[PDB]
Amino acid sequence: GTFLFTSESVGEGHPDKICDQISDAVLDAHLQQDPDAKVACETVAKTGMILLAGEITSRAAVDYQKVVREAVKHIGYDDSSKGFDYKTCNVLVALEQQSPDIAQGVHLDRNEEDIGAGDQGLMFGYATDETEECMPLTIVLAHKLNAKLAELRRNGTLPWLRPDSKTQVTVQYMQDRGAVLPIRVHTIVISVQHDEEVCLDEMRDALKEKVIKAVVPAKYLDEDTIYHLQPSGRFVIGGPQGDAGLTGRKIIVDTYGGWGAHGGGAFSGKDYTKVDRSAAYAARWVAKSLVKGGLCRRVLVQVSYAIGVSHPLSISIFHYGTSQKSERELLEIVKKNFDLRPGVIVRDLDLKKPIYQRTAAYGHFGRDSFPWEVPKKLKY
Amino acid sequence: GTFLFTSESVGEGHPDKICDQISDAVLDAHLQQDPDAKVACETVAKTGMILLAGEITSRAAVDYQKVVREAVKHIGYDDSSKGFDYKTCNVLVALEQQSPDIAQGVHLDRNEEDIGAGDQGLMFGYATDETEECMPLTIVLAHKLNAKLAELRRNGTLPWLRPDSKTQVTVQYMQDRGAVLPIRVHTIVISVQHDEEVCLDEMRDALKEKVIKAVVPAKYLDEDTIYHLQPSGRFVIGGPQGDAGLTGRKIIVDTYGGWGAHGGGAFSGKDYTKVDRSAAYAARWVAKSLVKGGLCRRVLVQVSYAIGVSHPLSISIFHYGTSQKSERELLEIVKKNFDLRPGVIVRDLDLKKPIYQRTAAYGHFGRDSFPWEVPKKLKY
């Protein structure tokens, strides 16, 4: 019954993640002034460049140069020695208003509760009782390893660290009638951008002792655990200089790490009318509510929409064999307890609030008791 | 036992798909001259702009202006009336060499069979016996509806069509010990960019009669099937003008439509050393080989890598209950029959061949008998 499963995560300075954070910094800046801003902000990053491309219709007055540069500063790219500098990079803007054809078909002259979905598409929510936060241990550990790197970089413990990092954790699991039980950590990968002076052995030792041991419980690590620490051997060039980044290129790191499923939509840079984000958040809320409500040990939820139509076109449940109730019964409980129209989700999950940049690194789920992480008490 | 499942697809002129096709046109152009080109070409599209950003180390002499414009011409954006024109758009290039730190850690001075993975990451392969091509019916139908639109546009049957389109199909399934059996089509969505002159009723009638009926077997359609045809009511603005596109933003349309799982990596614009593509192709090959070999009715395969390391870090199998063999036994059969090092996958799947632009619309799988679609005869 044992098997392996692998998930990854990336740091705040990974170039795709830089784009997600900037996209969400732009969204938040708009929402601070105009709670009804229509935002679809893509970000692209390459050597010395942040480009914003997309569509925004808003009453806010946003200083894009300031918002972008402040987000880059927060990440830690503040000097040409690190490969990227918020003070001196190029910020290019190719932002237009939202298409009037989309606006008229989605929200113009519509009662908010009855606004149409901002696009068609499919979205999934997932929850697993293997951790208290109802997330896969593989991705929780991978996120915490990146967070630890950023912590040691920021506190000056490991001053040779740079913001760009990736981690990957393979866990050996057992299964019990569809639920999954972590046994041990089989393999860990860590790659992190570093300065020109530190040697490989100093980095590998610090990664094992100060990073992995500070995050992963010793009970999961043993003589057989495989460690791939700085496996490329050298990672001085990094950030956008090493690899072009784009918004919405870490959608599995943003969600469930390979577990469950994904509908394809990116979250960052989008207001609530874009169901790629709001309905995925609501589907996480449903899944977590079914697990915390004791109806199942793990569950996957699908929802789908058509542009301009408020009610979902379909809702589906996969409980992996972890409920005594059938999937048909769980679906009925979901339909009796939730209303997944985007104009209702916005109210339940408070999706006009400018907290989106906080979601754009370390996963959107299983952290900080955001509204979609607080289970709904179910009636049936 | 019945349930719904939804998948989507998009047309060749959907702005994200335009970027995938251009990224792969660039890759193919390099491979035609240098089979060992190292390519990591991202494309961004917005009104009047194609931007290439990324890293290429190659001995080829590629005319980016010509390659980009020819790809856009093929798609059909050839006039300002359509919102985008290959003859007169801006083509911007921000392409650098591959990071020497990556090159030295991945492939420099390495025997080809022993080249390291070009990155860490996880990848999944999936196959289902519900169609002969071993793909989910939901996404096969969604792809064929977009292909039909392009066919009717190109042959002049529906001259009001433009290249940007999206489709979505919800199928009602039954299940049989983990395998899935399509019963009927529950809902279809079609949205397609159109000219200023055609009215909504003419478009809705043509979409039902000339598109849906020409693709979806009548046995799946009944009095209860729901049709959302041009649900936004107006879609004159389209292509990159209506919505910024990026490479690798249709990864679920590229794969399994919500079925199975995804590791997060984009395929287009990457040579074989980027396991995001090669290992996903190999994992599809494994899954399809297990189903066509009669070992299971449907199956999901995970593989993972560390940058610079040739052998996968993990391999896992989920057979949904559709094999008499355990997942442990199937994994042993996979390890005895396949070698998922990238330097072996390249030889088995002929991944230096410049056929990538052909993969960049209508899904990478279940079409055209590419090498990863030809099952391997298994020995056990």
Ligand SMILES: C[S@@+](CC[C@H](N)C(=O)[O-])C[C@H]1O[C@@H](n2cnc3c(N)ncnc32)[C@H](O)[C@@H]1O
């Ligand atoms: C390996 S790069 C993708 C391939 C790359 N575009 C190329 O040209 O080969 C993906 C991510 O890996 C990380 N990376 C960059 N340089 C690296 C290095 N020298 N060693 C390890 N990881 C690296 C960064 O997080 C980067 O965004």
Ligand SMILES: C[S@@+](CC[C@H](N)C(=O)[O-])C[C@H]1O[C@@H](n2cnc3c(N)ncnc32)[C@H](O)[C@@H]1O
């Ligand atoms: C709805 S747009 C995404 C949201 C958009 N960025 C915004 O500013 O609201 C996503 C895709 O839908 C399609 N689309 C564009 N305009 C549309 C319209 N008027 N009606 C329906 N679909 C449309 C195109 O395929 C486009 O790439």
Ligand SMILES: CN(C)c1nc(=O)[nH]c2cc(Cl)ccc12
């Ligand atoms: C066989 N069934 C019931 C499913 N098979 C899957 O592969 N995944 C699913 C995902 C959802 Cl959300 C619902 C149903 C299924």
Ligand SMILES: CN(C)c1nc(=O)[nH]c2cc(Cl)ccc12
């Ligand atoms: C419980 N097991 C065996 C799994 N549970 C999943 O949810 N998905 C999987 C995917 C793969 Cl590739 C392998 C195993 C599993």
Ligand SMILES: [Cl-]
């Ligand atoms: Cl990456």
Ligand SMILES: [Cl-]
């Ligand atoms: Cl889209």
